[PDB]
Amino acid sequence: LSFVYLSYRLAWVLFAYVLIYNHFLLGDIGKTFNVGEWDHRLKPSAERDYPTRYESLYILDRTQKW
């Protein structure tokens, strides 16, 4: 039942978020959206490849791999 209820609650809340944001909150994209990204390890770390909600605490970077 834990998995069932987790799935159902997440589905309902995320679907409500999708509908409300895409119908009512597109006037300011910067306010209602975050810009996120993560790229390959081969390429240098992306500008948006950082943990959200901690932009004022940490600068995230990593060593490239091949």
Site residues (vs another protein, CB under 8 A): 23-24, 26-28, 30-31, 34-35, 52-57
Q: Minimum distance between the CB of residue 65 and another protein, rounded to whole angstroms? A: 26
Q: Minimum distance between the CB of residue 15 and another protein, rounded to whole angstroms? A: 14
Q: Which is nearer to another protein, 10 or 25 (CB)?
A: 25
- Tokens read off for 10: 């997440």
Q: Which is nearer to another protein, 55 or 64 (CB)?
A: 55
